[PDB]
Structures are given as structure tokens and as C-alpha cells.
Amino acid sequence: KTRSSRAGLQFPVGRVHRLLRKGNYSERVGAGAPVYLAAVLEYLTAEILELAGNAARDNKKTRIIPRHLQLAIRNDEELNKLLGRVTIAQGGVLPNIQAVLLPK
Template sequence: MDAGSKVKKGAGGKKCGGPKKKPVSRRYSQRVGTDASVYLADILEYLADEVLEFSGNAARDNKKNMIIPRHVLLAVRKDEELGKLLAGETIAHGGVLPNINPVLLSKKNEKAQAAKDPMSPSKAANKSPKKA
């Protein structure tokens, strides 16, 4: 056999019987600028400062020296912007906000006012006498 008669093997493929290449697909994320990380750190620092300031005020209102999750919850829910930001979040061991339905308070207020005010003559006339 001649050197010229040798059959050259080409690159592998389906027709030549070589190794099969698998298609590779990669997902690339969008690039982030160098200033974005600094800006994000500033925002997180500002939010942490706000939450700690309001929580410290809530702790001081309750005459405590240490901030507990209850104080964080009270501070976040009291502030309008933080409450909107953390509306769907649950703070562990925070409890619930004290809330009494006004409908429940109205009956007690009426009874308290009736006890304070003496009965007017028109109300006294409408009152039925007690049966013995």
C-alpha cells in the first residue's frame, strides 16, 4: 500500500462513526454594574438603621433595655412605609398587634356614659316600674 492510498479519518460525526457531540446550552444572567453592589449595600444599611431605630423607640416605650422581636414587630407595623414593605412577612415570636374592634367598645362606652349621667326626666318616665 502506498502512503497516498491511506484513508484519512476526518472529524467524528454521525456519518463517520466518531464520538457524538452533545449540544451545550448555557443560561447567562444579565451583567451587573460595579456601582450596583455599593448602592444595594447602602439601601440595606439604611433599612436596618430605620428598623433598629424604631425598634429601640418601641423598647424604650415599654421600659426595656433590650430589643426583642415583639418590639421589631410593633415598630414595623406602626410605620406606614415599613409596614407596606413588610406587609406579607411574619416576624417570629412577634405576636400580634393589639386591636379591639370599635363595635365592641361602643357598648361599654354607652354604659359608662349612662352610669355617669343622671337620668333625664324623659328617660325616667319611659322606664317601667319594677314588679315586686
């Protein structure tokens, strides 16, 4: 009976609607707008968690940490593009050593 369940979403449609209404974005908010926005946030979230979870499994951790989020993000061209100006606290950087610096 929640708007989220009606939309087949985990993310909260009602909260998103209230946040649109209170964010000084516009005088009015249409009914589909928070459904759509919630859907998009949920999708991007699932994408990042999918990759991060893979990295956590490879590191044989059951638990995702910032490092895994950073690995997931920087190794994906599109996520990295989307989050280009973003600093992930405790994420570190990708191991990358310029070829010229290596011996031989």
C-alpha cells in the same frame, strides 16, 4: 481600604458583590451596584432599628426583641406596606379592639 469604608457604609460591599455574582442574577455586575444595594439595605435596617429601639426604650428594655420589631413595623405605614406579607415570629399583633365590641 474595604469597599464598604470607601462608601462610608457599615454593610459589607464585598459580600454583597459576591452574592450578586453568585445568585444567578446576571452575567456581569457593575462596581457601583453592590455599593448602592448595600447602602439601601443599611438604610432600611437603620430605619427599622431606630423605631424598634424606641419601642424597647418605652418598654424599659435595653434589648430589642421581636415584639419591638413588630410594633415598629406595623405602626409605620410604609414599613408595614413593604412588609405586608411577612410574619414576624414571636411578634404578636397590635393591640386593636373594634369599637363596636367595647361596652357602652
